[PDB]
């Protein structure tokens, strides 16, 4: 805002795993302020993947898929002499996680499973192995970032 | 591209509608990127201390993709107001079109 | 503008030396002078403006 670096708010960890990453994902899924609702979908999907894969640490599994999902290079719209060529830069660490979470939620929003918990569980399972629309979008971002690879 | 022709405090006639439509389609011939046109023909005063000379008004609010240009013209006669409004609108269309075309180089 | 890169010398520092020698020879200014034809009246105008600027320091 052509001004100072306004300080970011303090997120409160979710009650179950006590992880700020899961709290941030809960906020991402939540709409209309229904935090309890989003908590219940996020917990249902995480429990479903934990049971299906028989993994003791759902938060560690989620951290693994999140780190596997978040990109490394993005493309921005620069301007030199009224020209629009896309410049590949390195995503800032704060933006990496937000982009990954938003991609996961928006990819799980268009699955064929009955409930959003099931859709999110399926998307998490696919992203843990490197499939799904989240990986598709991340690879489509890397495709542009490497197919420019000439504007700094 | 829309064309609305409203009339405030005056009864817009078929002749007024033609006299605005013919010039609107003339500007829309050279510029094909117009989204909407709204022309208000008004009688904003009675000329009680100046004897007309600005008694009729013709204003055109046109909207293009990413910009909105408004012009107005006061005159004693509504047809002359319409023509002066149309000329200002044509000049502004030409100005925007040439700026956009010269932004590429 | 030839730079003879020596043994055990990185290509990076050798190219920095080559850039320094090309500036020393003023090669790219010579190339830029012939991009287009500059009319003698424009040449004299440019040189007199440069002379005024040089003398005002």
């Amino acid at each position: 805002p052509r001004r100072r670096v306004v300080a970011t708010r303090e997120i409160l960890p979710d009650p179950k795993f006590g992880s700020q990453t899961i709290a941030k994902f809960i906020n991402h899924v939540m709409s209309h302020g229904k935090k309890s609702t989003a908590e219940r979908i996020v917990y249902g999907a995480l429990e479903t993947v934990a049971q299906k894969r028989n993994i003791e640490d759902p938060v560690a599994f989620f951290e693994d898929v999140l780190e596997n999902v978040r990109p490394m290079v993005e493309v921005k719209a620069r301007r030199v002499g009224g020209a629009t060529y896309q410049v590949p830069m390195e995503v800032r660490p704060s933006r990496r996680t937000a982009l990954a979470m938003r991609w996961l939620a928006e990819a799980a929003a268009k699955r064929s499973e009955k409930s959003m918990a099931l859709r999110l569980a399926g998307e998490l399972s696919d992203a843990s192995e490197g499939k799904g629309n989240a990986m598709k979008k991340r690879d489509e971002v890397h495709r542009m970032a490497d197919a420019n690879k000439a504007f700094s | 591209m829309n064309v609305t022709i409203r009339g405030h405090h005056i009864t817009v006639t078929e002749a007024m509608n033609n006299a605005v439509h013919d010039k609107l389609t003339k500007i829309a011939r050279h510029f094909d990127q117009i989204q909407s046109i709204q022309v208000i023909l008004s009688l904003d005063n009675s000329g009680a201390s100046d004897g007309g000379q600005k008694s009729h008004k013709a204003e055109a609010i046109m909207r293009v993709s990413g910009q909105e240009m408004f012009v107005q013209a006061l005159e004693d006669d509504m047809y002359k107001a319409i023509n002066e409004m149309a000329d200002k609108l044509d000049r502004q269309v030409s100005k925007y079109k040439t700026r956009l075309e010269r932004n590429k180089v | 503008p030839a730079v003879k890169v020596k043994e055990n010398e990185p290509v990076d520092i050798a190219i920095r030396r080559f850039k320094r020698a090309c500036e020393k020879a003023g090669v790219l200014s010579d190339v830029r002078k012939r991009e287009f034809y500059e009319k003698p009246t424009q040449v004299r105008k440019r040189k007199k403006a440069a002379a005024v600027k040089r003398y005002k320091k």
Partner: protein, 114 residues
């Protein structure tokens, strides 16, 4: 052929790097317009970098190891090409700039009225 000369004909639009032998017999050549870069990307130091890699590695079959580069032109890709050639196993003997300059010879084209 062990000993060779790189010729980086850099230009504002395109950069052409060709490796020949001492007597100016071309071995391999690669440009930036024939590497997947067209228009705006062709006039970029990275395009000259990949053209230099393609040409140098394609001339390494002949067995050239010691190369002296000859840069010619004002193009952006006249240092990145040398860097790509050098950091590909080549041994740079010298880096000479040989772009032609007229001693007030032929008349230049008219100034662009953009």
């Amino acid at each position: 052929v062990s000993e060779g000369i790189a010729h980086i004909h850099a230009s504002f639009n395109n950069t052409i790097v060709t490796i020949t032998d001492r007597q100016g017999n071309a071995l391999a050549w690669a440009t930036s317009g024939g590497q997947g870069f067209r228009g705006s990307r062709k006039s970029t130091p990275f395009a000259a970098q990949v053209a230099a890699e393609v040409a140098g590695k394609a001339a390494q079959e002949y067995g050239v190891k010691n190369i002296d580069v000859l840069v010619k032109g004002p193009g952006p890709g006249r240092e990145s090409a040398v860097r790509a050639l050098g950091a590909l196993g080549y041994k740079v003997n010298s880096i000479s700039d040989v772009t032609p300059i007229p001693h007030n010879g032929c008349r230049a084209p008219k100034k662009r009225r953009v």
